[PDB]
Amino acid sequence: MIIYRDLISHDEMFSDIYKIREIADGLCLEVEGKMVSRTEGESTVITGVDIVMNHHLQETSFTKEAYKKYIKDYMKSIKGKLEEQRPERVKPFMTGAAEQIKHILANFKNYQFFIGENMNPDGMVALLDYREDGVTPYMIFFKDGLEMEKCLEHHHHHH
């Protein structure tokens, strides 16, 4: 199993037990999830996205203008990480990131916003939307903002 973690915050984001597809010419990953129902805890049944509940992702809120401010700083920070670790990626990342930001802002009303369990404001903001079938959730992550953890057995909850 591969655990995908936030390059900035080191929080767990998802694992390769889900269907993962690359979009935006390798800039983003779309991770397909399922709605699940669990008891929480007079107790109540809660329903949510398995990606969110399994990895303890935390919902947050943005105005469109606040997200614009956040995402320009985030893409600058990933640029710096690439200059340190993967210099060959910097130029195509800048190009793709600017266009993907345009896409996200144009489709802004169609996303919910999630961050890692420790809620670092400099970490990645994952985007939740639903497929046309109106039942399947999926989440968008920035591929260059992830690090991979190998885990053959007995995955540990850590950051």
Numbering used by the authors: 1 to 41, 63 to 180
Verbatim from the authors:
Histamine-Releasing Factor (HRF), also referred to as Translationally Controlled Tumour Protein (TCTP), p21, p23 and fortilin, is ubiquitously expressed in eukaryotes, and involved in apoptosis, cell cycle progression, cell proliferation and cancer (Bommer and Thiele, 2004, Nagano-Ito and Ichikawa, 2012, Bommer, 2012). In addition to its diverse range of intracellular roles, HRF is also able to activate mast cells and basophils, with the release of histamine, implicating a role in allergic disease. HRF can form dimers, and a disulphide-linked dimer was shown to be crucial for the cytokine-like activity of rat HRF. mHRF, hHRF and rat HRF contain two cysteine residues, at positions 28 and 172, and Cys172 is suggested to be the site of the intermolecular disulphide bond. The current model for the activity of HRF in mast cell activation involves cross-linking of FcεRI-bound IgE by dimeric HRF, mediated by interactions between HRF and the Fab regions of IgE.
The structure of hHRF-1, solved at 1.75 Å resolution, contains two molecules in the asymmetric unit. This particular packing arrangement is very different to that of mHRF, and has not been observed in any other HRF crystal structure. One hHRF structure, and the mHRF structure, contain non-covalent HRF interactions, but reveal different packing arrangements.
